[PDB]
C-alpha cells in the first residue's frame, strides 16, 4: 500500500491534520482543489469534519466547491451540521451552500444531521431549519441559483449559476419543491433545492 504524496493528496491530508501553512502552499500546485478522493471526500470535507475553521475559511474564500457531495451525498454543510457547528454552518450558507441538498440513502438535509445528544444542537438545528423555512421570504424574497437549470416545461425559468432572483410564491401546500420566481423581466417555476440564500464564491 503506497502512500500518495501528489499535490491533491497533500492538500486533503493537510486539511485533515490542520497544517494551514502547508494548505496555503500546496493549493497553487493542484490542478483542481475541488476534486475528490475515491470516496468522494474533498479538502473542504476534511477541513469541516476535523474542525479546522481557518482552513474552512481559506478553502471556501479560494473558490473551492462548497456543495461537493461525497459517495453518500454528504456536503460540507451536512458535515458542519453533524458537528453542531452553527458558526461554520452560517459561514457556509453565506458562501453559497445548498440548504436543501439531501444525503442519498436517507433523504436528509444538513439540518437533520445535527446531533441531539451533543452540545450546540438547539442553536445549530434551529438556525438551519430556520433558513429552510425563511428562504424566499426573508431578505425581500431574494435568493440565488447555485446551479444552471434548463426548463422542461413552458412555465419554468432558465437559471444560470449565480443568477439573482426574487421569490413571488413558495406554495408550500401544492408542489413544495417548486417556487414562483422573478428573474430579470420573466416569471416561472424553479426548483428550490438548486437555490441558496447567498451565491457561490467564484
Amino acid at each position: 500500500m503506497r502512500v500518495k504524496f501528489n499535490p491533491l493528496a497533500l492538500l486533503l491530508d493537510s486539511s485533515l491534520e490542520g497544517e494551514f501553512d502547508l494548505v496555503q502552499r500546496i493549493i497553487y500546485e493542484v490542478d483542481d482543489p475541488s476534486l475528490p478522493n475515491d470516496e468522494g471526500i474533498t479538502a473542504l470535507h476534511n477541513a469541516v469534519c476535523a474542525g479546522h475553521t481557518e482552513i474552512v475559511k481559506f478553502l471556501v474564500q479560494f473558490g473551492v466547491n462548497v456543495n461537493a457531495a461525497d459517495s453518500d451525498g454528504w456536503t460540507p454543510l451536512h458535515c458542519a451540521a453533524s458537528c453542531n457547528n452553527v458558526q461554520v454552518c452560517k459561514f457556509l450558507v453565506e458562501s453559497g451552500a445548498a440548504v436543501f441538498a439531501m444525503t442519498y440513502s436517507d433523504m436528509q438535509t444538513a439540518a437533520d444531521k445535527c446531533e441531539e445528544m451533543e452540545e450546540g444542537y438547539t442553536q445549530c438545528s434551529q438556525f438551519l431549519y430556520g433558513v429552510q423555512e425563511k428562504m424566499g421570504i426573508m431578505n425581500k424574497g431574494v435568493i440565488y441559483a447555485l446551479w444552471d437549470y434548463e426548463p422542461q416545461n413552458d412555465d419554468e425559468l432558465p437559471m444560470k449559476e449565480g443568477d439573482c432572483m426574487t421569490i413571488i410564491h413558495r406554495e408550500d401546500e401544492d408542489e413544495i419543491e417548486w417556487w414562483w420566481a422573478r428573474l430579470n423581466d420573466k416569471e416561472g417555476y424553479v426548483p428550490r433545492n438548486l437555490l441558496g440564500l447567498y451565491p457561490r464564491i467564484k
Binding site: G73, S105, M107, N153, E175, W178
Partner: protein, 205 residues
C-alpha cells in the same frame, strides 16, 4: 420508435376500468372518466380492473409502460427521479429495480423489463382469469415518483399504456390514459374537470 398509445379493444374486447373512485379530498387515488385521467398519491395502491369478452390465448401477458404525453418530451424514457432511486424507502428488499416508476403489488410473477434497444422500462404480469363468479381481473399498481419530481418526471405529464400481449410481443389489446401522481388527487380531479366542462361548453347540472 415511439411507443403507441392508441386504444385497441382487439379480438377479446380488452377493457381497463376503475372501481367507484372516491370524489373525496382524502382519496389516495381517483379516476376521471371525463378526462381519461388517473390521479394517484406516490407509492400508494391503485387497483386497476381488466375485462375481456373471451379468454385470450395461453401465455398472454399484460404490460404497463409510462410515456411522456407531450410531443417535445416523448423520446425521453419515464424513469424514477435520482433522489427516490437512491433512497432506502420503498427500495429495501423489493423485487422492483429502484429506477422503475410503475410497480405491480402482490404478484410474484411480475417482470420488470428494461429494453436493451429502446431503454424503455415497463412491468409485465401474466393474464389471469377473474375469480369464480367475478367479472374483472384486478391488478394492483404503484407509482413511485410524483409528476413534479425534479430530475424525474420534472412536472411533465405522462400516459400509462396498458397492453394485452402474446408471449412473442404481438398486441392483442391496448388502453391508455393520462397519469398524475400528486399530493391531492381528489382536489386536482375536481379542478381539472371544472376547467374542462367550462372550456368545452359541456352541459352540467
Amino acid at each position: 420508435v415511439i411507443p403507441s398509445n392508441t386504444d385497441y379493444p382487439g379480438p377479446h374486447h380488452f377493457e381497463v376500468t376503475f372501481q367507484q373512485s372516491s370524489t373525496a379530498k382524502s382519496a389516495t387515488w381517483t379516476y376521471s372518466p371525463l378526462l381519461k385521467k388517473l390521479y394517484c398519491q406516490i407509492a400508494k395502491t391503485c387497483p386497476i380492473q381488466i375485462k375481456v369478452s373471451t379468454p385470450p390465448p395461453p401465455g398472454t401477458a399484460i404490460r404497463a409502460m409510462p410515456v411522456y404525453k407531450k410531443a417535445e418530451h416523448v423520446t425521453d424514457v419515464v424513469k424514477r427521479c435520482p433522489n427516490h432511486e437512491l433512497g432506502r424507502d420503498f427500495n429495501e428488499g423489493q423485487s422492483a429495480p429502484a429506477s422503475h416508476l410503475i410497480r405491480v403489488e402482490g404478484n410474484n410473477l411480475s417482470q420488470y423489463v428494461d429494453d436493451p434497444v429502446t431503454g424503455r422500462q415497463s412491468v409485465v404480469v401474466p393474464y389471469e382469469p377473474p375469480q369464480v363468479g367475478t367479472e374483472f381481473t384486478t391488478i394492483l399498481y404503484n407509482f413511485m415518483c410524483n409528476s413534479s419530481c425534479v430530475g424525474g418526471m420534472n412536472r411533465r405529464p405522462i400516459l400509462i399504456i396498458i397492453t394485452l400481449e402474446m408471449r412473442d410481443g404481438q398486441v392483442l389489446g391496448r388502453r391508455s390514459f393520462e397519469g398524475r401522481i400528486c399530493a391531492c388527487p381528489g382536489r386536482d380531479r375536481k379542478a381539472d374537470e371544472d376547467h374542462y366542462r367550462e372550456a368545452e361548453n359541456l352541459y352540467f347540472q
